Structure 1
């Protein structure tokens, strides 16, 4: 007997408090494209919650157009979390986008357990917002399987596993369209037959944003909006955004290219498939100094790309190869996790290395190092900063780092911040009294 929400708390543009206003007033600003060519569109009205079999909790869904502003979608997600878990919900300090292969894959068991351990550890230790696609096949299903155990081991707050998928490919879209806007319980039938569409939604994603452009059974139309939403969310919660590539096709390559160009780091798992392996070769060819990689040539790469993506024209192959080389141009933005060179419990260390290689100020990187409980990394960064004459930045960020180490209950980090000439009686409050 679930009573429908009538009002929602939408956060102000100042970022100081939430105001209560009616749900129909906020949603009016989401538009929908039924005419593949109605550019402006009409109001959407396809928003609510989906009930999936064998899942106790229900998952919200919002169908919004491609031209819509990602800040409105970000409020919607913040407003729902604020409604469900109160105003003082655990804000994310890391946004882990995950992008890769839609079609099924058979990854080694050791590799699967290592990825599963690391992604889970990072999200729980940092209450991260994991953004993947919405289809039930491949990575999204694998990520869903990883997050099912988090939904089981935790009782009070579960991090959102947000699925952003392009509308027009979703099974049950006609069922989803029909109805009234206050649609709380809707049965989702993944096994139900639908003629032009063949891709069902994954039942383990906690929210869903169906990006619509008016097309039907055309993919890759939601990639740009997904990147824009992650960047907007990243600016809003001042948290770094880290994409992880697993296997992957041509659009994952374009996704990774977009990610580097916007300054977002990428973690590519070597040994996980095709495009990930292509990126790993490319890096090993371009920046790895070990002896076993010295027999690396562009001809074997180009032959590999040709064997993996299968382009129609040679110029297309040249463009794909050029794009792949453009992705790894900057060594800081790419971190490659490989089973035969690293440890089983070192995937979170790779994520932390991507964070340290792309975070500008020392304090943000030290806060993230606290979150992952890696003192050695923080100790090495502080000692290196101390040796290189960067003592002023250490003193400028030591108070805020000590204040967080106290709030997030990390005594061992508390000793460290003090050992580096931090007076206990020189603490300052974050706000002004």
Structure 2
């Protein structure tokens, strides 16, 4: 069901039980008319995040999966939108929303002193399972020149139950990147990950009593969280702890984690190719060179060809230096058609474009 809230109208798509995974995706794509996401991330530290990435997202755009500490960041992103574009989707249930009967049965006034955040301009009215489903759906959807789409899990100061949300997500083939200083289950995660015996039957209780000792817990939930943690810690790939109290660049470790991730899933050219396209977007070319080409992958020219075109078109010289140095023979690459393409891919704003146009 389609609805509009003249609050400047926000879109509502009815999110029925067991909804098709590719249904809400195409609905938000078409009914909301947003551009293709080149990146998706599902939610000192208060400035590091909201400055280094928020600014570095403007270059290429991305999608941010959130739920209306959190209010400060919501207001921050609201302030960031005031100054290619990034979109936010309000995938949320209907039970926790107030005045749900008013919107169920045309500006639906839902003034409540609960209501949803009016900063968002879209929503999907119907929870963790939907998150996992959409994540696996986007991670499979190939945005291309056949190009897949990135999705990441940013964890911060979470609660205990999130481990379950992480547990299945570890099976979801999703890299996890967590910060060590957020102040919740993130810190215990950061502490308990490194062990000779990766398990922790009771010292898990030792730390959960050590960190956040406001509520007392039964031993059954403690041993259950212990087995959950033992199951989660068995995928080092998706798992990636880091610190921002000493030194970093969030988009740098971001690529670091994503790259090490696409390392394990498989070893192909096209496998690494999305990530290489990523570094292309981020110009973190040194990282990839040390990491991707020189790291493991022995490339084939015919493959990298496409990317090479991309890189050149970006006036992006260095990566070309490398890809050529990676053994790309532009002599092989060159085609009068290839140059025809390249030139037709010139900037319309360029006086070159105008001059060529007058010529034509």
- Give the count of matched residue pairs: 323
Corresponding residue SS for 2:41: coil
Pairwise CA distance, 1:255? 1.5
Change (3 A) 1:409 1:163: farther
> 1:216-258 CA distances to partner (integer Å, 9 max, x unpaired)?
xxxxxx0001110121122223212101011122332222212
Task: Output the aligned Cα RMSD.
Answer: 3.0
In the other structure, the counterpart of 1:404 is: 310
In the other structure, the counterpart of 2:285 is: 375
Counterpart Cα distance in 2 of 1:64 and 1:224: 13
Counterpart Cα distance in 1 of 2:173 and 2:310: 26
Counterpart Cα distance in 1 of 2:23 and 2:153: 22
Aligned match for 1:304, one of 207, 219, 222: 207
In the other structure, the counterpart of 2:53 is: 119
Gaps of 5+ in 2: 342-360
Counterpart Cα distance in 2 of 1:348 and 1:338: 14
Counterpart Cα distance in 2 of 1:226 and 1:383: 34
Question: Is structure 2 residue 13 aligned with structure 1 residue 68?
Answer: no
Corresponding residue SS for 1:333: coil
Pairwise CA distance, 1:405? 1.7
Change (3 A) 1:252 1:297: closer
Counterpart Cα distance in 2 of 1:263 and 1:272: 24
Q: Is the 8 A contact 1:123 1:129 kept in 2?
A: no
In the other structure, the counterpart of 2:350 is: none
In the other structure, the counterpart of 1:353 is: 256
Q: Once superposed, which parts of structure 1, at least 4 consecutive aligned residues long, lie more than 6 Å away?
A: none
Q: Is the 8 A contact 2:89 2:123 kept in 1?
A: yes
Counterpart Cα distance in 2 of 1:266 and 1:172: 36
Normalised by the length of structure 1, the TM-score is 0.67
Change (3 A) 1:271 1:285: farther
Counterpart Cα distance in 2 of 1:78 and 1:203: 21
Higher share of residues assigned helix: 2
Pairwise CA distance, 1:301? 3.0
Q: Is the 8 A contact 1:305 1:321 kept in 2?
A: no
In the other structure, the counterpart of 2:41 is: 96
Aligned match for 1:201, one of 116, 124, 131: 116
> 1:125-156 CA distances to partner (integer Å, 9 max, x unpaired)?
332111112x3xx43x3442343244222xxx
Normalised by the length of structure 2, the TM-score is 0.79
Counterpart Cα distance in 1 of 2:292 and 2:261: 17
Q: Is the 8 A contact 1:147 1:161 kept in 2?
A: no
Identify the range of structure 1 (396-405 vs 224-233) with the bigger mean alpha-carbon deviation: 396-405
Aligned ranges 1:151-300 → 2 under 5 Å: 151-153=81-83, 157-178=84-105, 183=106, 185-191=107-113, 199-211=114-126, 222-236=127-141, 237=143, 238-285=148-195, 299-300=202-203
> 1:200-227 CA distances to partner (integer Å, 9 max, x unpaired)?
312233421233xxxxxxxxxx000111
Counterpart Cα distance in 1 of 2:98 and 2:150: 34
Counterpart Cα distance in 2 of 1:380 and 1:170: 49
Gaps of 5+ in 1: 1-44, 99-109, 192-198, 212-221, 289-295
Higher share of residues assigned strand: 1
Pairwise CA distance, 1:68? 1.1
Aligned match for 2:30, one of 55, 79, 101: 79
Counterpart Cα distance in 2 of 1:145 and 1:368: 28
Counterpart Cα distance in 2 of 1:203 and 1:119: 23
Aligned match for 2:240, one of 309, 315, 335: 335
Change (3 A) 1:382 1:320: closer
